[PDB]
Design a protein around this ligand. Structure first.
Ligand SMILES: [Zn+2]
Length: 257
């Protein structure tokens, strides 16, 4: 029964998921004055030309756009990574107001939203085995600010009405996740965790420096989603973000000078 309410939000998660107070929790604040350039880092390789989206699902905490991860169709390589990581889904976290919504922060700045493209390390065979490994997942995080519309997001926005409430899914084929990327692939990276229960410490985070812009109308449609199921009391799906967690014994590395 975890969520983002008064009685079940992030500050409560540790009771059911004690790793919430662990050594490698996410998100974190990215201090651009202490992150150090690492010349050993490589460019990211984002290979999404063969990506096969299948479906979009309201899971009660966000919505997931799901992909075919049964072949190396949409993969992330390079950067800080060893090996090949397959795209399984993306989702967002967003606010009730444009001044909050992101999970990571940059010099304490909160963005309006944050996109997570979730990938699992093919050496572990399946997502469920991957999340049990410290190097099981690679999550590409991308900040959203409100300004111009993002045309490559509109197909997602337009399906939201069909998945308003928890448990609803809809076919969602032929969606191109390349339309969600900024121009630059400059990034920060550090070791961390899932940002929702079970909060497993299995993620190499790759957070892009450059935000994408979405329009105020686009974000407004996200805020019409519901956390509840159909026929239950309406509770708007907003503020579905975990705040920054202590960095502890970690360093954030930058791909760029
Ligand atoms: Zn996420």
């Amino acid at each position: 029964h975890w969520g983002y309410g008064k009685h079940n939000g992030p500050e409560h998660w540790h009771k059911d998921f004690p790793i919430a107070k662990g050594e490698r929790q996410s998100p974190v604040d990215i201090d651009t004055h202490t992150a150090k350039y690492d010349p050993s880092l490589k460019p990211l390789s984002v290979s999404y030309d063969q990506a096969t989206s299948l479906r979009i699902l309201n899971n009660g905490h966000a919505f997931n756009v799901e992909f075919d991860d049964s072949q190396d169709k949409a993969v992330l390589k390079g950067g800080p990574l060893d090996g090949t990581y397959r795209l399984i889904q993306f989702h967002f976290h967003w606010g009730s107001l444009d001044g909050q919504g992101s999970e990571h922060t940059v010099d304490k700045k909160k963005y309006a939203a944050e996109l997570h493209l979730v990938h699992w390390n093919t050496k572990y065979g399946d997502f469920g085995k991957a999340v049990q490994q410290p190097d099981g997942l690679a999550v590409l995080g991308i900040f959203l600010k409100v300004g111009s519309a993002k045309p490559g997001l509109q197909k997602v926005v337009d399906v939201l009405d069909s998945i308003k409430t928890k448990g609803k899914s809809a076919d969602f084929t032929n969606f191109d996740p390349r339309g969600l990327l900024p121009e630059s692939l400059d990034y920060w990276t550090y070791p961390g965790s899932l940002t929702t229960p079970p909060l497993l410490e299995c993620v190499t985070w790759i957070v892009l420096k450059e935000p994408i812009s979405v329009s105020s109308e686009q974000v407004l449609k996200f805020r019409k989603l519901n956390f509840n199921g159909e026929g239950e009391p309406e509770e708007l799906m907003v503020d579905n973000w975990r705040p920054a967690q202590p960095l502890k014994n970690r360093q954030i590395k930058a791909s760029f000078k």
